[PDB]
Amino acid sequence: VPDITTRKNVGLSHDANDFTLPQPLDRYSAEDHATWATLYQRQCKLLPGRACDEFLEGLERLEVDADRVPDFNKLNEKLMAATGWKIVAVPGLIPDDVFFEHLANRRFPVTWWLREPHQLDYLQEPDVFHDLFGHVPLLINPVFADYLEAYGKGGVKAKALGALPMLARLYWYTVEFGLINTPAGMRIYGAGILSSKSESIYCLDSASPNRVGFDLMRIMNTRYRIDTFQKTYFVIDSFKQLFDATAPDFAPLYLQLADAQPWGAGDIAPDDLVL
Ligand SMILES: [Fe+3]
Numbered sequence: 380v381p382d383i384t385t386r387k388n389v390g391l392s393h394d395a396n397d398f399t400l401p402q403p404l405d406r407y408s409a410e411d412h413a414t415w416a417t418l419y420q421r422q423c424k425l426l427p428g429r430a431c432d433e434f435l436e437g438l439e440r441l442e443v444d445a446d447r448v449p450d451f452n453k454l455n456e457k458l459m460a461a462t463g464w465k466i467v468a469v470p471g472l473i474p475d476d477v478f479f480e481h482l483a484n485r486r487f488p489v490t491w492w493l494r495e496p497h498q499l500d501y502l503q504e505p506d507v508f509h510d511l512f513g514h515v516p517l518l519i520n521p522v523f524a525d526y527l528e529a530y531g532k533g534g535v536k537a538k539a540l541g542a543l544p545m546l547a548r549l550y551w552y553t554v555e556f557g558l559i560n561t562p563a564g565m566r567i568y569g570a571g572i573l574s575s576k577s578e579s580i581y582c583l584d585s586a587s588p589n590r591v592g593f594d595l596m597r598i599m600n601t602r603y604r605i606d607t608f609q610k611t612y613f614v615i616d617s618f619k620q621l622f623d624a625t626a627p628d629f630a631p632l633y634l635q636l637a638d639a640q641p642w643g644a645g646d647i648a649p650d651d652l653v654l
Contacts, residue, residue, distance in 0.1 A: 384471030384504055387492040391470065397480065398473040402451045402491050411493045412447035418499070418508045418574075419445050425579045431559050431566035433618075434573060437519030438512075448493055448507055454515075462518045466511065471504060475534065475543055482531025485524070487514060501575040503606075513574030514554070522618040523568070527554070529625035539633035545599035546629075548641075552598045553621060558582065558590065558614045565590070565614065565654075581608050589647055590614055590654035595624045596632065597651065601642045610645035614654070 393400045423445075426435065441457050443449055455465040467481065468491040481488050489510040494502055501509065518524045534546055555571035556578075565583060572578040582588070588608070591597075593615040601611070615621050642648055 382471075382504060383492070383495065383502075383506075384490075388470045393470050396477075397467075398469050398477050398488070399467045400470065400491075402468040404450065406491075407448045407493065410496060414493055414496050414499075415444075415448050415508060416446045419443075419512065421576055422512065422574065422579070425576065426567075426573070428564075429567055429579055429583055430573055431561060431568045433520040433523065434516050434568060437516030440519050441516060443512060443516065449511060451489070451491075454511075458515065458518060462521065462524050464518050464524055466515060475547075479531045479534025479537075479546075482527050483535045484531070485528055487518065487527070489514070500577055501571065509570065509574040513570035513572075517568060517570075520618055522622050526618065526622040526625060529622065530554075533625060533629050537629065537633065539630065539637065541637045542629070542633040545633060545636060548601055548603060549595070549599050551603050552601065552611075552613045553593075553615070556582070556603075556609050556612055557593075557621075558612045559618075560614050560616050568615075568618075569612075578608065582612055588612055589645070589651075591647070592616075592652040593620060593624070594650065594652075596636065597642070597648055599632065600636050600639050601646075602644050604644050610643075 391400060391403060440461060441454060443454070451466050451468060459465050464485045464487060466487050466489045469488040471490050473488060478488060490506050492506060493508060494506045518527070530550065537543070537546060554569065556569040559566050559568045567573055567579065567582060572582050589611045591611060591613055593613050598613055603609070647653060
């Protein structure tokens, strides 16, 4: 049983070093554009009062197509002038070192293909709607864009054994599933939540999960689960705080956490500050 990444990339090559390729525009059907249109309108009706304001405005400022899979090159004209970043198409999942290298150079990899109609909510493997709709708009906030860039640079430098899981955890709990407390109430900045119907509602509506204040060392030592609703969400007060977190060189931090047993995705640590 071949995964969608394989079926979608048949007859398509990718750079051996950075896994990029020109966006294969001819490969989007009429149905894919309708699938995109459906995803897009469904999220936009859920996000008011949910997504943080920066996300909403980035969507507006970049003019992410509402009715068809965006043309990466066109979007880049705006994204580059506004933030200094560009998106590059990748075939699907790429190696971490290649991913860190892109972020370090203000390139955001985006899986080019779209989920098939039979699918629809945060399926196995991220796709263009998740990657583009969920990740790209926030780059409109210069501090969050600076955070991503610093995160990639730290990744390029990481050597210590155990560092990769720690950085995967940090990325997951901020970039993919992060929440942000605002004067108007708790909001969302995580891509894995913003491109998902179910997660968008759950992360702000459920009594079950823990909602914990951002804490760097705690996060890097916290497991996460892939196919279920998150059991813990980490909350930042501002993007600056997120950026400031990348200020220290992480080298000694990996060594400190290296032998620690990690927290379960559902645990509450002694030093947590919980909602
Ligand atoms: Fe993602």
